[PDB]
Ligand binder design. Structure first.
Ligand SMILES: CC(C)(COP(=O)(O)OP(=O)(O)OC[C@H]1O[C@@H](n2cnc3c(N)ncnc32)[C@H](O)[C@@H]1OP(=O)(O)O)[C@@H](O)C(=O)NCCC(=O)NCCS
Lengths: 140, 140
């Protein structure tokens, strides 16, 4: 009864990969700090961004469920990659700072909604205890 | 260590989000099972794909380190989402099957290169204990 999601990932050349998902094709490379090219998508930016997308889509469920009139949501993502005590690297922290536009009458529901969103977010769950995840917000 | 990676993610409408990294724009939405449109990227496909891209870029660092001559690399990724004992859902398993082309003389080095790639992959590290990760390969 699992829902199964499939994709393909190949080596182009050098430090360059191609992600294929349905009819979409994305170049995802090593970043400059590890010898890759400048100006491309990297796992280092794409993974935290997908985290922040999943957080937002989980929030949207709770937003509908709780009758919140959401006007806008913009989030800035800051991911820190650093040394692991197991050698090599790991994500130390991923910070997601959200600017939320809602009706004033809905503001009181937001702490709960945000906590729920992060709790039930599939990617948040995936990285629990291994990466510090700091989600905060301000009303605009 | 410490390197900072930044992105932005906004709500478009409905269950749709836009990822911005530099000048790159990517639509990432809930899947149809969770109220998103057909034919778009979803966190359920993108996140497993970025995991596989990270496995590959880590392997590429080790193959150069070890003098392995890599001819080709193709991988198929299957992600299975299901109910969580914590309520809601979680990724249960992500499988990555790699078809690797190498010089015959390099094949004896591949078990260790793959071990190292999986061990040091930072997205693999990020999901340790929370999602089952199954990586295997065949030569082509
Ligand atoms: C929403 C969802 C978590 C509900 O889970 P469930 O297994 O039915 O469990 P529950 O009904 O207990 O709800 C989970 C929590 O949400 C709370 N909740 C649900 N609806 C609520 C509402 N209308 N108002 C306030 N709280 C609500 C519950 O009280 C519960 O709280 P708790 O964690 O503190 O115990 C689940 O259906 C889901 O994950 N759906 C996918 C959401 C989605 O679209 N995500 C994006 C995918 S890309």
């Amino acid at each position: 009864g699992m829902h199964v999601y499939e994709s393909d990932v190949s080596w182009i050349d050098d430090r360059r990969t191609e992600v294929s998902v349905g009819d979409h094709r994305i170049e995802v490379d090593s970043p400059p700090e590890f010898g890759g090219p400048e100006g491309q998508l990297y796992p280092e930016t794409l993974f935290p961004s997908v985290l922040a997308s999943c957080l937002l889509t989980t929030f949207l469920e709770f937003k509908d469920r709780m009758g919140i009139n959401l006007k806008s949501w913009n989030s800035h993502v800051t991911a820190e990659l650093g040394p692991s005590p197991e050698k090599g690297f790991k994500f130390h922290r991923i910070k997601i700072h959200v600017k939320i536009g809602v009706n004033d009458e809905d503001k009181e529901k937001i702490p709960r909604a945000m906590q729920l969103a992060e709790k039930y977010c599939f990617i948040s769950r995936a990285i629990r205890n291994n990466v510090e995840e700091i989600v905060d917000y301000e009303f605009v």
